[PDB]
Amino acid sequence: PEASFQVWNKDSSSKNLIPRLQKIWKNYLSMNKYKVSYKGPGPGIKFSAEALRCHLRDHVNVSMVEVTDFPFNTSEWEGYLPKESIRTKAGPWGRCAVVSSAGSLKSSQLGREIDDHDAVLRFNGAPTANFQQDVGTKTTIRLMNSQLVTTEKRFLKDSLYNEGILIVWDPSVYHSDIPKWYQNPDYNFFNNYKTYRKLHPNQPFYILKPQMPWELWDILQEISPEEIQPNPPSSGMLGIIIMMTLCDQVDIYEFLPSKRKTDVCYYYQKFFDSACTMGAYHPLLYEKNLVKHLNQGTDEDIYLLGKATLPGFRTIHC
Ligand SMILES: *[C@@H]1O[C@H](CO[C@H]2O[C@@H](C)[C@@H](O)[C@@H](O)[C@@H]2O)[C@@H](O[C@@H]2O[C@H](CO)[C@@H](O[C@@H]3O[C@H](CO[C@H]4O[C@H](CO)[C@@H](O)[C@H](O)[C@@H]4O[C@@H]4O[C@H](CO)[C@@H](O[C@@H]5O[C@H](CO)[C@H](O)[C@H](O)[C@H]5O)[C@H](O)[C@H]4NC(C)=O)[C@@H](O)[C@H](O[C@H]4O[C@H](CO)[C@@H](O)[C@H](O)[C@@H]4O[C@@H]4O[C@H](CO)[C@@H](O[C@@H]5O[C@H](CO)[C@H](O)[C@H](O)[C@H]5O)[C@H](O)[C@H]4NC(C)=O)[C@@H]3O)[C@H](O)[C@H]2NC(C)=O)[C@H](O)[C@H]1NC(C)=O
Ligand SMILES: Nc1ccn([C@@H]2O[C@H](COP(=O)(O)O)[C@@H](O)[C@H]2O)c(=O)n1
């Protein structure tokens, strides 16, 4: 016969969420903090996986703030941003791993497998020490939100941040260009970016262009059967797209969750919240639908290992 097991449902909706998470999604729609007005193709468009993969290659620009982008060409900013492109400094690589921060990484023993990739991408303050067996020890790129850089005092102390390439991102007003956003960042991480950058010059540290998250959101909203959270996508999803541009093959672990699915938010923290898995602020739900939809692994890989495989843009047909 055939195996009857539940891996991530590609067509999940608000009407598949707990009431408590349903309310939170409604509230975020009202707020519209970032002044989103989706005027793209009506939500609910059906894309092939190959087709949607090209769409993401073509309509999402993965670029870092360069010295040529006004106003990072002004004197006050001179000598802060890294000289060469991130593409130059990072790879290209064959097989890469994106490690979510999910609590379901607990007792996964995924460490050795994670470390057999050329590069590993982690998020925010996700630690490696004490968790190597489940989580690995290698950190090649670390993606952080601007809130952490701005307000986490440990960002300028903990050695964990001192490994590999750093990238920071900050949500901007919807469809904003670089100068307007510089005026109105969601968190003013600019001082601390300059401050860290003074302390670790030989550590590459980039700033994601503010447009990248929204260009991705537009695609999310185009696919989704309903209106999604008017907030930018989660760090996890950005980290995936980033790696798809740096690798030929990206493995994502415990994003689409395994059989160890749990309310425990992080592998490295002891608190529960279903929202970290199912989404609150971020349209994480619809991000997961997209990953499942582009998965080139089997369902069995998801259930047992929490593992999803996407091809790098470098390798696709168009
Ligand atoms: C992402 O990102 C990206 C990028 O960004 C960036 O990138 C970089 C790299 C660069 O590029 C920069 O720039 C950018 O920014 C993006 O993309 C983009 O986008 C945009 C849009 O939006 C675009 O723009 C456009 O452009 C064009 C062109 O340009 C050029 O130049 C420039 C400088 O600046 C550059 O940049 C570019 O690239 C180009 O270049 C080119 O290249 C090419 C290649 O590709 C080349 O080729 C070559 O060459 C050589 C030598 O020659 C040889 O030949 C070989 O073979 C080849 O191959 C070339 O050379 C070069 N050059 C040229 C020029 O070509 C422009 O044009 C445009 O403009 C237009 O349109 C617009 C809209 O859009 C408008 O507004 C304007 O106005 C115009 O229009 C026009 O107008 C005029 C008047 O004014 C008219 O005229 C008329 O006409 C008639 C007849 O017809 C008559 O005659 C009369 O009399 C008159 O008047 C006309 O018509 C019109 N037209 C129409 C159509 O309408 C624009 O500006 C760009 O390009 C892009 N880039 C890229 C790269 O792609 C994106 O978008 C992003 N994404 C997102 C999503 O966001
Ligand atoms: N339970 C969890 C916890 C985190 N994550 C992913 O890991 C990423 C990193 O988590 P933080 O952004 O909270 O540091 C999230 O943006 C999300 O994509 C998840 O998918 N499930």
PDB file of N, CA, C and O in Angstrom, residues 5 14 39 49 52 60 84 99 111 118-120 124 133 146-147 159 170 179 187 199 236 266 285:
ATOM      1  N   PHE A   5       1.234   9.729   5.710  1.00  0.00           N
ATOM      2  CA  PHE A   5       1.875  10.597   6.697  1.00  0.00           C
ATOM      3  C   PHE A   5       1.820  12.076   6.339  1.00  0.00           C
ATOM      4  O   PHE A   5       1.932  12.452   5.170  1.00  0.00           O
ATOM      5  N   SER A  14      -5.181  30.706   6.395  1.00  0.00           N
ATOM      6  CA  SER A  14      -5.570  31.231   7.697  1.00  0.00           C
ATOM      7  C   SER A  14      -6.589  30.291   8.330  1.00  0.00           C
ATOM      8  O   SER A  14      -6.597  30.091   9.540  1.00  0.00           O
ATOM      9  N   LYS A  39      -0.573  45.915  -5.635  1.00  0.00           N
ATOM     10  CA  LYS A  39      -1.293  46.241  -6.845  1.00  0.00           C
ATOM     11  C   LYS A  39      -0.810  45.334  -7.956  1.00  0.00           C
ATOM     12  O   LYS A  39      -1.014  45.610  -9.134  1.00  0.00           O
ATOM     13  N   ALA A  49       6.491  24.649 -10.584  1.00  0.00           N
ATOM     14  CA  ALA A  49       7.674  24.819  -9.733  1.00  0.00           C
ATOM     15  C   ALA A  49       8.851  25.387 -10.527  1.00  0.00           C
ATOM     16  O   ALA A  49       9.506  26.336 -10.089  1.00  0.00           O
ATOM     17  N   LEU A  52       7.901  29.131 -11.343  1.00  0.00           N
ATOM     18  CA  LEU A  52       8.021  29.952 -10.155  1.00  0.00           C
ATOM     19  C   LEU A  52       9.484  30.135  -9.735  1.00  0.00           C
ATOM     20  O   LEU A  52       9.850  31.172  -9.202  1.00  0.00           O
ATOM     21  N   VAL A  60      13.481  39.041  -8.085  1.00  0.00           N
ATOM     22  CA  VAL A  60      13.998  39.302  -6.749  1.00  0.00           C
ATOM     23  C   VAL A  60      15.478  39.584  -6.876  1.00  0.00           C
ATOM     24  O   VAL A  60      16.244  38.718  -7.314  1.00  0.00           O
ATOM     25  N   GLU A  84      34.548  44.519  -1.848  1.00  0.00           N
ATOM     26  CA  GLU A  84      34.061  43.710  -2.965  1.00  0.00           C
ATOM     27  C   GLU A  84      32.669  43.131  -2.724  1.00  0.00           C
ATOM     28  O   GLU A  84      32.229  43.036  -1.584  1.00  0.00           O
ATOM     29  N   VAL A  99      20.152  26.502   8.194  1.00  0.00           N
ATOM     30  CA  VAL A  99      19.675  25.971   9.468  1.00  0.00           C
ATOM     31  C   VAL A  99      18.670  26.916  10.133  1.00  0.00           C
ATOM     32  O   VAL A  99      19.032  27.976  10.643  1.00  0.00           O
ATOM     33  N   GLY A 111      23.731  17.352  13.023  1.00  0.00           N
ATOM     34  CA  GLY A 111      25.005  18.050  13.004  1.00  0.00           C
ATOM     35  C   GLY A 111      25.985  17.662  11.911  1.00  0.00           C
ATOM     36  O   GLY A 111      26.432  18.523  11.149  1.00  0.00           O
ATOM     37  N   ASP A 118      29.406  22.795   1.950  1.00  0.00           N
ATOM     38  CA  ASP A 118      30.485  23.767   1.787  1.00  0.00           C
ATOM     39  C   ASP A 118      30.261  25.015   2.650  1.00  0.00           C
ATOM     40  O   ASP A 118      31.200  25.608   3.188  1.00  0.00           O
ATOM     41  N   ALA A 119      29.005  25.407   2.789  1.00  0.00           N
ATOM     42  CA  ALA A 119      28.666  26.580   3.583  1.00  0.00           C
ATOM     43  C   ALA A 119      27.434  26.338   4.442  1.00  0.00           C
ATOM     44  O   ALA A 119      26.557  25.562   4.072  1.00  0.00           O
ATOM     45  N   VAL A 120      27.383  27.001   5.594  1.00  0.00           N
ATOM     46  CA  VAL A 120      26.213  26.948   6.451  1.00  0.00           C
ATOM     47  C   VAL A 120      25.730  28.348   6.823  1.00  0.00           C
ATOM     48  O   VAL A 120      26.516  29.179   7.296  1.00  0.00           O
ATOM     49  N   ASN A 124      20.421  35.272  13.352  1.00  0.00           N
ATOM     50  CA  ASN A 124      20.425  36.058  14.563  1.00  0.00           C
ATOM     51  C   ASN A 124      21.404  35.547  15.606  1.00  0.00           C
ATOM     52  O   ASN A 124      22.583  35.368  15.293  1.00  0.00           O
ATOM     53  N   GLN A 133      25.701  18.526  18.103  1.00  0.00           N
ATOM     54  CA  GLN A 133      25.157  17.258  17.629  1.00  0.00           C
ATOM     55  C   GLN A 133      23.901  17.456  16.795  1.00  0.00           C
ATOM     56  O   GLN A 133      23.714  16.792  15.781  1.00  0.00           O
ATOM     57  N   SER A 146      17.659  43.969  11.977  1.00  0.00           N
ATOM     58  CA  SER A 146      18.270  45.208  12.451  1.00  0.00           C
ATOM     59  C   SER A 146      17.936  45.468  13.902  1.00  0.00           C
ATOM     60  O   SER A 146      18.622  46.225  14.585  1.00  0.00           O
ATOM     61  N   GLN A 147      16.860  44.845  14.367  1.00  0.00           N
ATOM     62  CA  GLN A 147      16.434  45.016  15.743  1.00  0.00           C
ATOM     63  C   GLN A 147      17.534  44.490  16.662  1.00  0.00           C
ATOM     64  O   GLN A 147      17.946  45.157  17.617  1.00  0.00           O
ATOM     65  N   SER A 159      31.278  36.350  21.307  1.00  0.00           N
ATOM     66  CA  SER A 159      32.180  35.956  20.233  1.00  0.00           C
ATOM     67  C   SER A 159      31.444  35.265  19.082  1.00  0.00           C
ATOM     68  O   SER A 159      31.940  35.243  17.958  1.00  0.00           O
ATOM     69  N   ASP A 170      16.753  45.134   7.416  1.00  0.00           N
ATOM     70  CA  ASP A 170      15.837  46.007   8.125  1.00  0.00           C
ATOM     71  C   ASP A 170      14.621  46.223   7.231  1.00  0.00           C
ATOM     72  O   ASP A 170      14.768  46.586   6.062  1.00  0.00           O
ATOM     73  N   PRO A 179      17.538  55.899  -0.303  1.00  0.00           N
ATOM     74  CA  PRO A 179      17.570  57.148   0.476  1.00  0.00           C
ATOM     75  C   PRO A 179      16.359  57.371   1.393  1.00  0.00           C
ATOM     76  O   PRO A 179      16.552  57.812   2.526  1.00  0.00           O
ATOM     77  N   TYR A 187      14.532  50.018  12.439  1.00  0.00           N
ATOM     78  CA  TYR A 187      15.412  50.132  13.592  1.00  0.00           C
ATOM     79  C   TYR A 187      16.674  50.817  13.133  1.00  0.00           C
ATOM     80  O   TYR A 187      17.235  50.446  12.105  1.00  0.00           O
ATOM     81  N   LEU A 199      35.357  47.432  15.189  1.00  0.00           N
ATOM     82  CA  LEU A 199      35.970  46.396  16.026  1.00  0.00           C
ATOM     83  C   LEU A 199      36.375  45.142  15.254  1.00  0.00           C
ATOM     84  O   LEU A 199      37.286  44.428  15.667  1.00  0.00           O
ATOM     85  N   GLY A 236      14.332  33.645   7.779  1.00  0.00           N
ATOM     86  CA  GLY A 236      14.514  32.297   7.246  1.00  0.00           C
ATOM     87  C   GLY A 236      14.367  32.270   5.747  1.00  0.00           C
ATOM     88  O   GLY A 236      15.290  31.866   5.038  1.00  0.00           O
ATOM     89  N   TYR A 266      12.560  27.832  19.822  1.00  0.00           N
ATOM     90  CA  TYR A 266      13.949  27.712  19.379  1.00  0.00           C
ATOM     91  C   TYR A 266      14.603  26.437  19.911  1.00  0.00           C
ATOM     92  O   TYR A 266      14.223  25.934  20.955  1.00  0.00           O
ATOM     93  N   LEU A 285       3.756  31.222   7.132  1.00  0.00           N
ATOM     94  CA  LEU A 285       2.884  30.192   6.634  1.00  0.00           C
ATOM     95  C   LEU A 285       2.999  30.059   5.120  1.00  0.00           C
ATOM     96  O   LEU A 285       3.145  28.958   4.588  1.00  0.00           O
TER      97      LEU A 285
END
